[PDB]
Every structure is written in structure tokens, then in C-alpha cells.
Amino acid sequence: MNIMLTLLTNVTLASLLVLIAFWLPQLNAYSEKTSPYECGFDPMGSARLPFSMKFFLVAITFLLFDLEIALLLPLPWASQTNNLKTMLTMALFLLILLAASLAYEWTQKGLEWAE
Amino acid sequence: TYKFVNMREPSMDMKSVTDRAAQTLLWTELVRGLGMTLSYLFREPATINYPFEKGPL
């Protein structure tokens, strides 16, 4: 209940602001006011052709690293155990491989952004 | 008469490297930049109240 009412109120408030955004200010528009903005002169035709960036390698390792943080998230409740020696060894073990993966990723070009 | 603007070689003694490392980790030149923006905040703005205060000609 409480959480969904808050979620509902926010989207209605946001949507109402859109509705008064596009309707209260009346429009006198044409085909040149809808032209894409390219700092003045005519665009050469772009914005949907393959725009290949370079950080794809580190973009996808973020996904791998984001899974590491998922694995080590339960640590606050993991400390409340009776065998901390095993918990400590395993907790540092995940951090070590996370550090090891970053270090090996670093050494082989890795974080460097392709030219 | 010419002067070399950028020909400063930092010292390699244990003192200087730590200060550079301390500058690196504990951001100091960034704090010096921050600290001086605070100095201008408390200063006297130079804006003239146009059109009640027209500029000097």
C-alpha cells in the first residue's frame, strides 16, 4: 500500500506537469522549428548510423564487475556468523579475484580507450 | 633576455616525494583552488546598479 501510493503520486505529478507543459503553452510551429539542431548549418545526415565508441571493453567489464558487487553485497549479514575465519577468508578471496581481474585487465591494454 | 618558464625538476628525496604523494591523495592544490573561491565570495562585488548607477565616462 504505502509504497505503491508513493509511486503512483510521483508519476501522476510528473505526468500532470507534462500535460500542462504541452497544452498550456499554445503552439505556432512549422517544419523549420522542428528541424534537428546542429549548431546552425545543415546536418550531413547522422544520429542513427553506427556511432562506434571505444570503451566497449570497459563497458562490458563493468557488467562483470557489477556482478562482483552483487556477490559481495550480503557482507553486512555475513559478519553475523559463528565461523568468521572462513567468512573472512572467502570475503577477501572474492575481493582478491576482483582485484586480480582488474589488474590483469589493466596490464593487457584493457582500460586504455581504443584510438 | 629570455626566461625558461617550465624547467623545474622536482627533488627525489624522501621528503619531496611524500609531499607530492600527499598532494596527490589528499587533494591540496584542489583545496587551494577551493580555498580561494571562498575568498572571493566574502569580497565586495563590483556590480553597478544600472540604471541608478551609470558607468564612468
Binding site: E32, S35, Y37, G40, F41 | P45, A46, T47, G55
Partner: protein, 155 residues
């Protein structure tokens, strides 16, 4: 009364318009340098609500500062046509007004008027940063005397 209600409502909109003008800098020539001095803390254009904002989709007024060369004339029209249009154009300097020093050249249009409609004209070469502040102040007065709602109520 209906006329009174539309009168106050128009004033509220006109106050909201004149109190927030966001120039889209078309800095072209030495007229632009003096305009930046208006943004400099000596005159502080920002203090009047008017603050510089790029992306003509998010700007209200054009400040034509400098000569308008025939080569770039399509650019002036295109960036003028892309403004959400409660919109006004301020011409700075003799060159932007009617050609100025280069009125007789082969590649300078004799005034920015031939490309775009022009609101208040700011004379000078360059007009001092204080003179432009007077110009922007004149536009605020012009916006104040807008009867958009009264005309609609009497259509």
C-alpha cells in the same frame, strides 16, 4: 469581470517573460566582446534575471553581435527558426543594424533585418556594454506592453 481577469493573467505571463530572457549568443565580431563585458561583473547581466544559455531550443532572445556575412546568413535564419517562439531579436552595433562600416562590401548583407525580423535596435560601433544593458531593458519594457490575452479576449 472577464476583462480584469484576463488583464491580470496577461500581466503575470508578461512579467514571467520579461523577467527571464535567455540570450542565445551569436557572437560574430567585436560587438560580441562588449556584450561579454555586460556579462562581466561590472554590469552583471545575470542580476536582471537575464542569463546566457546555449541550445536555442532553450533560449528566448537572439543578440546579433557583429557583422552578418553572406556565407553564414543561412545559419542565422536556421538558428532563428529553431527558437521556441515567444522570441525577440536584438541587433548590436552598426554592422548588425544596417551594415555599418561594411555596408558597401560584396559579402556583407546590409543589415540583419533582411534575414530576420528585428526588435529593438542597439546603435554603436561597438555599443558600450552599458548601452546594451539599456537595450535589453527596452525589450523588457516592450514585453511589459504586450496585450496577448486582451487581444484574445477581444477577438
Amino acid at each position: 469581470r472577464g476583462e480584469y481577469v484576463v488583464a491580470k493573467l496577461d500581466d503575470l505571463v508578461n512579467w514571467a517573460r520579461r523577467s527571464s530572457l535567455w540570450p542565445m549568443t551569436f557572437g560574430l565580431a567585436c560587438c560580441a566582446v562588449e556584450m561579454m563585458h555586460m556579462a562581466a561583473p561590472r554590469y552583471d547581466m545575470d542580476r536582471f534575471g537575464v542569463v546566457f544559455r546555449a541550445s536555442p531550443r532553450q533560449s528566448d532572445v537572439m543578440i546579433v553581435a557583429g557583422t552578418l556575412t553572406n556565407k553564414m546568413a543561412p545559419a542565422l535564419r536556421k538558428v532563428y527558426d529553431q527558437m521556441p517562439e515567444p522570441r525577440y531579436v536584438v541587433s548590436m552595433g552598426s554592422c548588425a543594424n544596417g551594415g555599418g562600416y561594411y555596408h558597401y562590401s560584396y559579402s556583407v548583407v546590409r543589415g540583419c533585418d533582411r534575414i530576420v525580423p528585428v526588435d529593438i535596435y542597439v546603435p554603436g560601433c561597438p555599443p558600450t556594454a552599458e548601452a546594451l544593458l539599456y537595450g535589453i531593458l527596452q525589450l523588457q519594457r516592450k514585453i511589459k506592453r504586450e496585450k496577448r490575452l486582451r487581444i484574445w479576449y477581444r477577438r
